[PDB]
Each structure stands twice: as structure tokens, then as C-alpha cells.
Structure 1
Amino acid sequence: PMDDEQVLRHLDQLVNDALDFNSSELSKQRSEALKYYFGEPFGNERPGKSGIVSRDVQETVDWIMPSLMKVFTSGGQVVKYEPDTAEDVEQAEQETEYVNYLFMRKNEGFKVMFDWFQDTLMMKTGVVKVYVEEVLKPTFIRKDKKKREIKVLCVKPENFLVDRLATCIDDARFLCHREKYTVSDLRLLGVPEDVIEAEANREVWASECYTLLDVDGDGISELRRILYVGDYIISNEPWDCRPFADLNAYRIAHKFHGMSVYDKIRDIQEIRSVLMRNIMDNIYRTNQGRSVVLDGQVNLEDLLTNEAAGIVRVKSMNSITPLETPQLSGEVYGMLDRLEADRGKRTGITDRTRGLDQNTLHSNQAAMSVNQLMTAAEQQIDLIARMFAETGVKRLFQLLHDHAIKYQNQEEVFQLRGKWVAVNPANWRERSDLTVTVGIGNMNKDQQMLHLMRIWEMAQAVVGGGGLGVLVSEQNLYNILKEVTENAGYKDPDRFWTNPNSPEALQAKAIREQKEAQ
């Protein structure tokens, strides 16, 4: 019943089969997509022919990405725990700001998104890895030792081996992620012999395995992560879970990975490149003069002037004939408008990233050309962002795993100084992304002008007859003003006017009112 030394060879056999399954098809597909991205030749070009290529993924990526950057990185209010209401500052606001420092301002900044969003656009999926690290340099008074922290990184997506029956991040029976782990680091770990192989680094490519098996001779237990060297001595302990993201980015049917704009637009860009190549062929080949033989025999006019037709006309006495080879139709260049409508309307309907004017100022007639043409009538990019957030909440949850396990007794300085123990917090396993994405969540301009027209001014018009005695109080108007200031870019410091509710205001308000009422 004991299963020892068999798991080694078993996963050794599994690695080659899984590589055959994946890299033959998926790696080739994404590598071809990358070659298309960087203008590698497609095959239609020939010696002495056209050379125009298709360069279109660049602009769609550069139209989609900046909107994602401007919508994602906005304060630390992106994800809300929304726990039981009364006690929230202790964990709901403390732990979000904790993960704000440990993710933002500490780990690559928002560039992590710039290092993962492209994975969700180019590689059909972006899958982060969450890994432990140790900090050092005590007194060599700073008598603090063996600090613990955890970061998030890539594992070279070509190194994300998954089983053949997973179709989901939390279903992978077999998982494999491999990194560099130089030989000096093996000696740091006390490796007792050589490696698979003048230089200390002998091309060691260490492999990490996430698999569930039965080493203890009991029922099938949780997965035990394995740090391999060369299919040799291991380090296995009862582990917790898989620290990954797995952003399918389009939510395809139940498959390991989703799909990308590559699979959508490879063929469209191929036909575009073929059209441009044939246009260049029309420019080049169809405009060739020759010996200008009316009929002639002249051994086909010296064999088309030795296959060149450059400079020869001596056949016998041939008269003036331009010899215009028939050319393409006039609709081929007129097809450009139709194909531009075909492709631009797919995901980059905002021609050159935006829709605006130079001749006439965009006023705000009624409902703001309602709701920005109904968010450009529900652009798919908003839904892609929604999926991004809804699946990247997993990153925060995986962070909270290790935070609740053990980090430190660190203190942070959000808006104040003085915080407390995070050794034993509650994860609350419940989060939200309501005011960020496809949820009703009226956008900046939308909310601004909606409040301006139907809230700011309707109250100021109705107050003439009834008055503020029963109408909106000062605090609610100040809350609307505060959200307006946040719409201006900064919540508090943009435009104070604040004095909502305080003894320095409310008691001051009462004493000032009685000052002017005497």
C-alpha cells in the first residue's frame, strides 16, 4: 500500500506527455500570434513581389489597455469586504489598507497589472504566482530578525503545465510551474550531489509540482507541493492550496484556458495583409512597360527582354503601344472603408481611443447624450474588465490566506500612525466590486452631470416654494459636494466647503444662526 519512489517516476512520465499535449498546439498557436504581433512574414510575399504585412494587434491593445489602467488604479477602494456592518474598521478597512501597502507601493506598483493584463490579452490567460520570501539584516537598535513577506510574480507562462481534465483553476489534479533556482541556491539548500546539467550555474531549471497523492498510505489527501531538482530528492509537507490567478479574460466554455483577441483577429489581419499585398502588386507588376510589340514574334521579344522587360525595344519595327497590363478594380480601395467599419466596430469603436470634436463643442443637451450613448451601448471591454476584477479577487483571497497564517505585527501609516496585530485576523471570505465595473455605478462624467442636472439644480429650483426646512439637509448636500470633488480628481482636498457635521460646525452653526437671529 505504501506509495514511495513511484510518484517520482510517475510524474516524470507525466511531464513528457503533458508537454506533448500542450506545447505542440497551444505554445505553437501563441508563438505564431506573437510572430504576427511583431510582423513576421506570412508567406504571400515572393521575390520581386509585395511585402506589406498586417500590424493591427498593436493599436487594439493600445486602445484597450489605457482604459483598463485608468479604471483599475483609483484609490484603495477597489474591493470591499462588505462584512457585518457594525464592526468593520477592525478588519474590513484595516486589512484592505494592509493589502494596499503589501500589493501597491511595495510590489511593482500597478505595473503588475501591466505585467498580467497583456497575459490576459496576448497569452489568452494571466496566472499569477504568490510566493514566500524572507527579509534579513538585523543589528550587525534594530534587533529584529527573520522577517517574513510574500510577493507575486510570473512563472514564464510557457511553464504553466496543467492536467488534461481541469477546465478550472481550483480543479487541477496536476500542476507544474518551473523557475530558475540557480545552483548556488541549491547549495544554499544543501543539495548533496550534482545536477542534470566552468560555471557554477550549470543550466539548472528547477520544477515545482502541485499534485495530490498518497505518501502516508491513507485516503487521498490534499496536494503536497514538491520542489524538484532532477527527479531526485524532494521536500514535501502538507500544503494549503494553489496560489494562482487564472484570468481566462473572456470566460470561454469549461476549458483550461479562455481565448484572446488573437484568435478573433488573426484571420481578419491576414485578409487585410493579403489585400495590401495585392494592392502593392497592382502598383508594381501591372505598371510595367515592355518592347511595345504590336504582335511580333521576336522570340517573345527577346524572352521579355531576358525576363526583365526593363530596357529593350528592337523587335522588328513595332509601333507605339503602351502595353498596359490589366489592373485591379476600383472597389478594392473603396473596400477599405467597409473593412475599417468591419474591424474598428469590433472592440476599438472609439476611433483613435476616443470620440470627440474640434469644430463644435460637446454640450450636455439632455441626459448627456444619454449615459454616453449608453456606455457606447455596453462596450465589451467593460465586461472584460468586470471578469478581470471578479477573477482577480482571487489574488486578494490568496494573500489573505497567508496573512491569516502568519506575517508579522507590522504597523502602517494610512491616513494616521498606529496600527495593530495582523497575526490572527479574519479573512471574511467575502468581497465586492460594485462601484468599479459594469455594475450600475454611473461613471465620472455620467454621475457628475446627472447630479448637476437632476439633483444639484432640481433641488435649487424646488427650494423656492417649500424651502430647505423639510428638504435636503446640509449634510446630504455636503456628501454630494464631496463626491463631486472626488469626481474632480481628489475627494477631500479638491474643494473643501465641507463643515458637514461637527461641534466646530453644528454647534457653530447653531450659535451663528442665533447670532444673526437676535
Structure 2
Amino acid sequence: PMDDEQVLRHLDQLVNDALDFNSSELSKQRSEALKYYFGEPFGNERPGKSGIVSRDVQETVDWIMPSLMKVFTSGGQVVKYEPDTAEDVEQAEQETEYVNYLFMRKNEGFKVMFDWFQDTLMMKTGVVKVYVEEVLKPTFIRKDKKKREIKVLCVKPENFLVDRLATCIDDARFLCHREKYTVSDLRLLGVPEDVIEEANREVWASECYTLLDVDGDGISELRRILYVGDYIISNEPWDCRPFADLNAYRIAHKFHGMSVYDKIRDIQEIRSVLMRNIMDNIYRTNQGRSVVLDGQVNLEDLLTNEAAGIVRVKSMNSITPLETPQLSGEVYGMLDRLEADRGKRTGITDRTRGAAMSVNQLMTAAEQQIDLIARMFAETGVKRLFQLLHDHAIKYQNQEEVFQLRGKWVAVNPANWRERSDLTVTVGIGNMNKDQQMLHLMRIWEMAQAVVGGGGLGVLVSEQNLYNILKEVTENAGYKDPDRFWTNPNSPEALQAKAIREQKE
């Protein structure tokens, strides 16, 4: 109530506490993740021996990329409203194109999306912020003045201080987003004076989205504060937080989730230590521990690391070189299952995809995780693909579909699906390429040809639905529209090709 200055101190306290807790915990965890990604020694390596760390999360992420890239960086037809019958055609795909045209192909491509996936996969937090900007450079035809454009940027989630007790995107009581906002942006705001911190004085600024009550009443809606250094702020009520605070792993109830590190740390540890053990065993087998007394060979044998040829002591002839017993090759075979460890964690590419040649792609590549992982990562984007969607749905532009037809208009204010559908590749119906290829084509068309031999084609599917029977083949192959139309539902060419020449042949 009647809070105008105590809010600055309270936000300062919240920012400091969030800095402490979030920085310490999340930064240390993400630093461990990035160090495991890089592959330098963990720090427990004794001096004089190699600190080998075999990279495993790298190929993990590079193995989980392909499916997700195929399902996100391919069109926008993945999600359909199927809305109310009256207002369906003139809004549904209009907004589909509208959103897949703003966010993809007008917001720096998928580079923001790819770095955002990288942050949610390795750096342990993926979240981007959506804001607006004004266009410049008019002709003073082409009078482009005061145009408003919606842009999205990675928040540098290291600078995404937030309460850990939210567990969801629309639960954070305090969202802090820290960025540079150089002294040029300070002058843009209007402050001539700066903070303790050359025009670019690398000044640092923060933005707070929080629910408060400064009007002497109940707790109001979200408020936006430009808390830079506890100075002149830009206070403003906020409508909806333009964030999605990914976790990529739907971990137990907390704001931030685990990463590739928290699931592949054990695999990387065991692989690195068994590489180290294998090379140490090679060392002790190719060295030979010569137990020699002093007074003969006083110079430490050079740790038995130099080449002379014969041991010799002095005048005696005892010599006690002991040969350490060798190993067994099963460790290498054991080494194999560590790849299968990725094969059991993330490595689909033990085979390219997955008796009857190992039914169901060898029972999903011997019970592969990543399908589920893909599914959950899909849901990881779902809310994002909703939030930014609304951030687009207000007003951006009037662009058309080029998608399989030319000529479309603006989509202004329809709904936002109140959902997202991501079932066509994963734990949903999600039959991936070659398995559904084999099963569907072989079964249904051996049945079809058996009937055609027995009964015929007229009783069963006709060419109008051989359209779909072959279109599933083509979409498994990846060419729907361009190479083969085959649509023929009811066309002028159908009459002269099926109802005239085929009937009167």
C-alpha cells in the first residue's frame, strides 16, 4: 500500500537473494554441465597421469537433435485448431501461417530456437523473452514509419533470476531478466546519469516482472520494473510474462530442471575412469615393475622410463623384475555397452532407426528412451509454442500462405489453440518412418492385391483413396506436394480419365 520507494528496496532484496541462490546453485550446476561437455579433467586426476575425459553429452545432444529438428524446423502444419465449424477455414491455417511466419522465418530463423534448446539441454535453463521495437529508415511510396515489430531474444538464463518455488511458467512471483542496456539505452530511457558500473560503459541493467500492490489495495497484476541500479526505473503493469522457462526434462516440482549433465554424468564418469584404467593397465603391462635394491642403479631407474636394453645391477646377479598379469578383452566388450549406455540413455544411432527383421524396429532399438524424451522435449516447447503464439496473435503483419496454395490474408484475433498437438512423431501415434512404412504398406496392400485377385478394386479402395494410400508412402519418403500430386478427389480431369476413358474402354 502507498509503496513507491519501499518497492525499490524490496526488489533490490529479491534481486540480491535470487542472485545468491540462483547464481550459486544453477550456475555451478550448468558450469559442471559445460565442463563435462568440454571434456577437461574433473579435478580428481593425480599429477603425472593423463586426465582424459571422454565426451559423451556432446554426441548425446547431437543424437537427440535430428528428430526435434525434423519436427520443429519443418513448416508449421504440425498444429491445427480444428475449431468451431463456422469460423474454421478463414482463421485456422491463417493463424498457423501467421505464427510460423513470425517466429520461424522472421525471428532470426531457428538460431534463437537452437541456442534456446542448447541452454535448456546443457546450460540447464532454456527461456527467451519477447518484446517489441519500432522500425526506422522511411523515405523522406515506402513510408515505413512507426511500424511495430515483435522480437524474441535469449535472456542469457544465467541472468534469469527467479524464485525457485514456482515450478511452472505462470507461477513465478518474481521474474528477473538481466541484460546490458548500454549507456546508449540509458540515454534512450532519458537518464543522463549512470551507475557505478567511453560511451559504452558496459553498464548492467535488470527487468523485473512481479505481482504487487502499490495502490493501497489488493495484489494487482504483473508489473514491469526497469530496476537497473536502484535508480530511475520504468515502472509499468505487465500483461503476461513472455517466457517459457524450459527444463527439457519435466523434473520434480521446482522451477529449474535437470540437464544432459544430471543424466549422463555417471556414464561420462565411468567411461573416463575405465579409459584411465585401461591406459594405466597398458602402462603397468608395458612397463614391468623391477624391484631393485639401492646401491645398484641409484638413479631411480628413471621411473623405468628410458631405453638402454639390459637391466644390470652392479656386481650381483639376482635382478627381480616382476611381470604383472595381463587383462581380458571383455572390458572392450564391456566398453561396448557404454555406447549401449547412450543406447540406453540417448543413443538411437546404434542402428540408424531402431523375426521379420527385428519387429517394431527391434522393439524400439531395445527399449530406447528418447522417444519418450522426444515427447517430453516436445511438451517442453508446447507451452512456449503457445506463449509466443499469443505474443504474435495480437497484430504483426498481413502475410499469406505460400503453403500448397497462393493467396491468403491477415489473421487478426482468433484463438490460440488453447493447446498444442505433437503426437505424429513420438509417444503419441508417432510411428516413425521405416516401421510404419513396412507395416502399413506391406500388410494393407498385400491384402488389397489379394482381394483384387479375388474380388477386385472397385469393391475396395478406388484411385481417389489410393491417393491417401500412396500419400502416406510419400510423406514417409518426404515428398507430399511437389513431385506427385495424385490428389484426384473430384476434378475435371477425373471425369475424362476415370469416368469417361476408363468406363468406356
- Whether TM-score is above 0.5 comes out as yes
State which drifts further: 136-145 or 158-167.
Answer: 136-145
The answer to whether the 8 A contact 1:169-1:246 is kept is yes
Between the two proteins, what is the percent identity of the paired residues? 100
Q: Any idea what SS the aligned residue of 1:129 has?
A: strand
CA distance in structure 2 between the aligned counterparts of 1:489 and 1:190, rounded to whole angstroms: 54
* 1:348 Cα deviation after fit: 1.5
* 1:207 Cα deviation after fit: 0.4
1:400 is aligned to: 389
Q: Residues 388 and 23 of structure 1: is their aligned pair in 2 closer, same or farther, counting only changes over 3 Å?
A: same
Q: Any idea what SS the aligned residue of 2:291 has?
A: coil
State which drifts further: 3-12 or 370-379.
Answer: 370-379
CA distance in structure 1 between the aligned counterparts of 2:191 and 2:103, rounded to whole angstroms: 33
* 1:297 Cα deviation after fit: 8.1
CA distance in structure 2 between the aligned counterparts of 1:436 and 1:326, rounded to whole angstroms: 52
CA distance in structure 1 between the aligned counterparts of 2:177 and 2:140, rounded to whole angstroms: 37
* 1:267 Cα deviation after fit: 3.0
CA distance in structure 2 between the aligned counterparts of 1:90 and 1:314, rounded to whole angstroms: 96
* 1:430 Cα deviation after fit: 3.7
**Structure 1 gap ranges (5+):** 356-365
The answer to whether the 8 A contact 1:486-1:494 is kept is no
**Pairwise mapping of residues 23-62 of structure 1 onto structure 2 (< 5 A)?**
23-62=23-62
* 1:273 Cα deviation after fit: 2.1
CA distance in structure 1 between the aligned counterparts of 2:309 and 2:28, rounded to whole angstroms: 43
* 1:422 Cα deviation after fit: 3.2
* 1:78 Cα deviation after fit: 1.5
CA distance in structure 2 between the aligned counterparts of 1:374 and 1:330, rounded to whole angstroms: 29
* 1:31 Cα deviation after fit: 0.5
CA distance in structure 2 between the aligned counterparts of 1:377 and 1:86, rounded to whole angstroms: 47
Q: Any idea what SS the aligned residue of 1:123 has?
A: coil
CA distance in structure 2 between the aligned counterparts of 1:115 and 1:292, rounded to whole angstroms: 57
The answer to whether the 8 A contact 2:209-2:241 is kept is yes
* 1:27 Cα deviation after fit: 1.0
Q: Residues 301 and 291 of structure 1: is their aligned pair in 2 closer, same or farther, counting only changes over 3 Å?
A: farther
The answer to whether the 8 A contact 2:95-2:393 is kept is no
Q: Residues 215 and 418 of structure 1: is their aligned pair in 2 closer, same or farther, counting only changes over 3 Å?
A: farther
The answer to whether the 8 A contact 2:339-2:347 is kept is no
* 1:222 Cα deviation after fit: 0.8
CA distance in structure 1 between the aligned counterparts of 2:347 and 2:257, rounded to whole angstroms: 21
Q: Residues 487 and 337 of structure 1: is their aligned pair in 2 closer, same or farther, counting only changes over 3 Å?
A: closer
State which drifts further: 483-492 or 205-214.
Answer: 483-492
State which drifts further: 407-416 or 168-177.
Answer: 407-416
Q: How many residues align?
A: 505
* 1:416 Cα deviation after fit: 4.4
CA distance in structure 1 between the aligned counterparts of 2:199 and 2:98, rounded to whole angstroms: 40
CA distance in structure 2 between the aligned counterparts of 1:491 and 1:471, rounded to whole angstroms: 24
Residues 165-203 of structure 1 deviation map (CA, whole Å, 9 limit, x = unaligned): 211111100110111211112212222322332x11112
CA distance in structure 2 between the aligned counterparts of 1:306 and 1:63, rounded to whole angstroms: 42
The answer to whether the 8 A contact 2:94-2:409 is kept is no
Q: Any idea what SS the aligned residue of 1:224 has?
A: strand
Q: Residues 278 and 390 of structure 1: is their aligned pair in 2 closer, same or farther, counting only changes over 3 Å?
A: closer
* 1:457 Cα deviation after fit: 2.9
* 1:368 Cα deviation after fit: 6.2
TM-score by length of 1: 0.86
Q: Residues 216 and 470 of structure 1: is their aligned pair in 2 closer, same or farther, counting only changes over 3 Å?
A: same
The answer to whether the 8 A contact 1:301-1:315 is kept is no
* 1:387 Cα deviation after fit: 1.9
The answer to whether the 8 A contact 1:148-1:408 is kept is no
* 1:154 Cα deviation after fit: 0.7
The answer to whether the 8 A contact 1:163-1:174 is kept is yes
State which drifts further: 371-380 or 306-315.
Answer: 306-315
Q: Does 1:496 align with 2:489?
A: no
The answer to whether the 8 A contact 2:340-2:347 is kept is no
CA distance in structure 2 between the aligned counterparts of 1:51 and 1:276, rounded to whole angstroms: 10
Q: Residues 57 and 305 of structure 1: is their aligned pair in 2 closer, same or farther, counting only changes over 3 Å?
A: closer
Residues 191-218 of structure 1 deviation map (CA, whole Å, 9 limit, x = unaligned): 2322332x11112111011111112222
Q: Residues 446 and 27 of structure 1: is their aligned pair in 2 closer, same or farther, counting only changes over 3 Å?
A: same
State which drifts further: 452-461 or 88-97.
Answer: 452-461
TM-score by length of 2: 0.88
1:8 is aligned to: 8
CA distance in structure 2 between the aligned counterparts of 1:469 and 1:330, rounded to whole angstroms: 63
CA distance in structure 2 between the aligned counterparts of 1:312 and 1:472, rounded to whole angstroms: 87
* 1:7 Cα deviation after fit: 0.6
* 1:38 Cα deviation after fit: 1.0
Q: Residues 311 and 257 of structure 1: is their aligned pair in 2 closer, same or farther, counting only changes over 3 Å?
A: farther
Q: Residues 283 and 479 of structure 1: is their aligned pair in 2 closer, same or farther, counting only changes over 3 Å?
A: closer
CA distance in structure 1 between the aligned counterparts of 2:227 and 2:185, rounded to whole angstroms: 13
Q: Residues 375 and 135 of structure 1: is their aligned pair in 2 closer, same or farther, counting only changes over 3 Å?
A: farther
Q: Residues 353 and 311 of structure 1: is their aligned pair in 2 closer, same or farther, counting only changes over 3 Å?
A: farther
Residues 32-86 of structure 1 deviation map (CA, whole Å, 9 limit, x = unaligned): 2211221222234333323322322222222222232234333322122221245
CA distance in structure 1 between the aligned counterparts of 2:392 and 2:434, rounded to whole angstroms: 38
* 1:415 Cα deviation after fit: 4.2
* 1:512 Cα deviation after fit: 2.7
CA distance in structure 2 between the aligned counterparts of 1:305 and 1:491, rounded to whole angstroms: 69
Q: Residues 82 and 436 of structure 1: is their aligned pair in 2 closer, same or farther, counting only changes over 3 Å?
A: farther
Residues 214-249 of structure 1 deviation map (CA, whole Å, 9 limit, x = unaligned): 122221111111122221122222221111122221
The answer to whether the 8 A contact 2:39-2:52 is kept is no
Q: Residues 456 and 306 of structure 1: is their aligned pair in 2 closer, same or farther, counting only changes over 3 Å?
A: closer
* 1:502 Cα deviation after fit: 1.2
Give the alignment's Cα RMSD to 1 decimal: 3.3
* 1:342 Cα deviation after fit: 4.5
CA distance in structure 2 between the aligned counterparts of 1:338 and 1:408, rounded to whole angstroms: 53
* 1:295 Cα deviation after fit: 9.2
Q: Any idea what SS the aligned residue of 1:507 has?
A: helix
State which drifts further: 103-112 or 222-231.
Answer: 103-112
State which drifts further: 159-168 or 400-409.
Answer: 400-409
